[PDB]
Design a protein around this ligand. Structure first.
Ligand SMILES: Nc1c([N+](=O)[O-])[nH]c(=O)[nH]c1=O
Ligand SMILES: Nc1c([N+](=O)[O-])[nH]c(=O)[nH]c1=O
Ligand SMILES: Nc1c([N+](=O)[O-])[nH]c(=O)[nH]c1=O
Ligand SMILES: Nc1c([N+](=O)[O-])[nH]c(=O)[nH]c1=O
Lengths: 295, 295, 295, 295
């Protein structure tokens, strides 16, 4: 037997950083969870019990805190690129670093209509993520994403004209509830190294904002023919607005809300045009995915 | 042996209801999770296998949907009082109904600065809850609450002057991070029945809003001497603003963020006035509770 | 306003302890999660920012580790009584301590049919818990429990003869699946203090074992008329087997498995006596409770 | 823009099946959660709102129940291969089916030392999984795995001789606790189709059992030089015992248990050879992976 692939590192490293404006007194906080896995000439740690090739996972944890102390942590695309580059430059035998960052929301509170200088609220569990792969001699590959964005529309979703055969019981509909948790990922053109990532810094936050805005507006305004059709419209728009993106991937559950027939009870009407009370279904759920690129 | 206490019913009943304004086209959605447990002359179902005294839990589930079809579901204090009253009036041998409702957020989306007629977003996992106990001959007891409100302030929290003995290692501090998940409950004066609950309907939403506003403002503005001292200030204010409340209870975890000493690494300064990067601690956590009433 | 009730302390304190037999080389591990809340003359910490009355929650955490170092951690009824007693004896102004312990399973591995000296497996997420309330001048109250014991029987459960009215759709049945997660609590006679708890030490593990055995055998062997009837039989037996128990409480969900009518597809028969494939339902669920005491 | 990749289907489909032995009265239950995603000539559902190419996800759900009614559900490698093959044979324009199955434990109860005919217990949350990819013209690829197997050894784990530099604070050790949750996957040689999968049916359960046995014995008996070294020994053995496996992949967290220095308290000794009480750490954790194949 032989080692075909190997990677190791530290997961679930929680990090908080505060910035304090000396002039204005305003403070800004960032909180993230970081995972770093390394690859390289490490096979002998597995095959021969040779620990000499191992950067201890505890040391990887220390390096994450030190790097956050000495560099900006925003945008996460930049921080992840700095952190990954560190490992391949510092250790001759480490040839790839894989960095995943999940950013948690701490939104400034408004008190009496004015933004508070040092108080924050977690408004929803929506995340902004990055995956950064730094590979010696092959540059920096970055996938940015948003996830945990949960939405619902109460009308203006349809689903009819699908294949009907002996396995089919679903009725066609021209008016249904559509609810989903959005997972959207945009993959950047390969960057040659840290200098090139730095040169595009302003585009990272702007593209995240665009992706979010397009997602919400398209969902709200599309008279949806299917989850498939609506998600493709989202992806098209994002690609049109940022040339440095190569592909956009969406993964959307269809979280079902079922009509409840109450006609057995005193002829109560609660289906079709009379539907008011529905039963949200925890499982099963539809799952629809697509990756859109340039023609 | 004898049955000393018994209650039974249906838990985790998910319910969604939509309201459609015929004039304006605007739709509004409500989504809740409901639990109903009954008590009464039911001991023989346990001791003698006499199912004749049992309202099947499946029927309780049906009753929740039927009741939501025929009545307003907001404010939840009213819906819970209607639902509980139904069981004690309908069934001669049922003498108490216990109704718990958890309301989930579906906040109207703003698209292009304008509120959308039928699209919603889940903004955070904060809940608004009620517990309603309807007891034959003893009226209606309602406890309203908010929970899952997660906040953080980066300065203006202190903790010094506590008891020091041979079990104490904690250093006094004049500047720390304070973060918590707020659970706040206000208990209403007993109501004589449904007519009296209906007479106070406007107070329910207004008191929830007041409780939330007082919580957020006090947390943001108090130069906190301890979690104990800050939470008492919150409770005092709520009692002063609504005379029909008898007690206010707060339960607050103290979610710790620890300094990281980096001085071992090239003399890096990251403690006290130089602290920028911290380690959020998942566990353990402080837990502080208090119930405040009228003197 | 006035403080009506107050308690504070440390939650989610994870503790592991190893015992090493010097003679045999055999090692035994214990892992628990502990919560301790104190009450006493502490109202001024809330009302006047007087921290002098506060035993810091960090110190409570230290005390849990120190106590585990110096005393046996098993049975948990004893450890909880030692820990709670410590706080009321050490601090003049603390008058009650509330200790909750959750014990996690680490079961010795059998390798080649022989018990291994120092290797363990987590066999299921079933827990053994205690709640110990130590109150100055009122002795020690202990509630012991098991929870997270998940079972299923595929036949020999019935449910017929329940109340039928205009809210009822459920069909009577003489053969259904019964599945539940068992939560069972036995409350001990009040103990005068630590000496009396020590005098009964052997009864704690034996009573836990009896409670578990009775639960499993009764569930397996009863041709169940309802969840109500089966759970009462369990409670009766436990009370008969241990005189120092005052009450037994059971809380059982009824986790539904629904038949799937497949007759629409080529007349496939999958209901009643032909039922083979079922749909487990995540929610809603029945919830049945009872507390049984001595006549 | 163009569709580069697309797949869609149903997730979280819970299924239970019972087998009833007519002769002996013995019943056996199986419970699983199934996910099926399809690929094929479906791009126009995304680009042109052409639902004619869509097999509704509701129909996929129906097909899972029908297939479970008409075929054995064990071993899961076989059931997954039957289910995936169905979709590519039935629908001309569907060219790949991806089937994931998670099997939940229902272990027969022993009552009075004898196996009960129809009562079961969930012994731990360990799962047995399969991923089956059925691709038109390219056969059937199966990855089998076990996951959620949580173990701990209290001694006979070491970690010394790793790289030490200016980022390193970790002390070398010759005696530590090692605890992990095991995720192990074995990938089978490609099968030409269903006939070939059927021909190897007995090997599936036997190989799962071997993988589990090797994992547990190696963990218990290895005087571990590192997680890397121990996991490689596991993988080597599995490959040696089953020739139809091409690769074995392990993913193991290192769940840390930290010493607690109590010397500040009356000189209490609780470190090194005196360590008895430890603090389990919820996060961060090491994460070690490797894929082993044939030389
Ligand atoms: N860093 C590592 C540790 N460790 O404790 O840091 N232990 C291992 O077995 N392997 C590692 O890579
Ligand atoms: N409603 C009840 C059911 N049931 O199925 O509805 N089963 C029981 O054992 N008990 C109940 O109360
Ligand atoms: N122990 C306590 C702390 N503390 O940090 O330990 N902080 C508080 O606000 N209150 C406490 O009781
Ligand atoms: N099966 C599908 C449904 N559906 O409801 O089954 N809805 C969609 O938008 N897309 C689907 O593929």
């Amino acid at each position: 037997s032989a080692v075909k692939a190997a990677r190791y590192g530290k997961d679930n490293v929680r990090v908080y950083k505060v910035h304090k404006d000396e002039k204005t007194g305003v403070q800004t906080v960032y909180e993230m969870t970081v995972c770093v896995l390394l690859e390289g000439e490490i096979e002998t740690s597995y095959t021969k019990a040779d620990n000499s090739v191992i950067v201890a996972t505890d040391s990887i944890k220390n390096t994450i805190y030190i790097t956050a102390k000495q560099n900006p942590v925003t945008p996460p695309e930049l921080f992840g690129s700095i952190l990954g580059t560190h490992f391949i430059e510092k250790y001759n035998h480490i040839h790839a670093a894989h960095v995943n960052i999940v950013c948690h929301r701490w939104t400034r509170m408004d008190i009496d209509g004015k933004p508070h200088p040092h108080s924050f609220i977690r408004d929803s569990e929506e995340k902004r993520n990055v995956q950064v792969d730094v590979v010696e001699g092959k540059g920096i590959d970055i996938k940015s994403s948003l996830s945990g964005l949960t939405v619902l529309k109460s009308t203006n979703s349809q689903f009819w004209g699908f294949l009907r055969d002996e396995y089919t019981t679903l009725k066609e509909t021209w008016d249904r509830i559509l609810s989903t948790d959005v997972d959207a990922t945009w993959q950047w053109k390969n960057f040659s190294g840290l200098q090139e990532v730095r040169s595009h810094v302003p585009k990272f936050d702007a593209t995240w904002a665009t992706a979010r805005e397009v997602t919400l507006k398209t969902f709200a305004e599309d008279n949806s023919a299917s989850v498939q059709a609506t998600m493709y419209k989202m992806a098209e728009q994002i690609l049109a607005r940022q040339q440095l993106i190569e592909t956009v991937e969406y993964s959307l559950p269809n979280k079902h809300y079922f009509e409840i027939d109450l006609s057995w009870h005193k002829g109560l009407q609660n289906t079709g045009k009379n539907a008011e009370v529905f039963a949200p279904q925890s499982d099963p759920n539809g799952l629809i995915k697509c990756t859109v690129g340039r023609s």
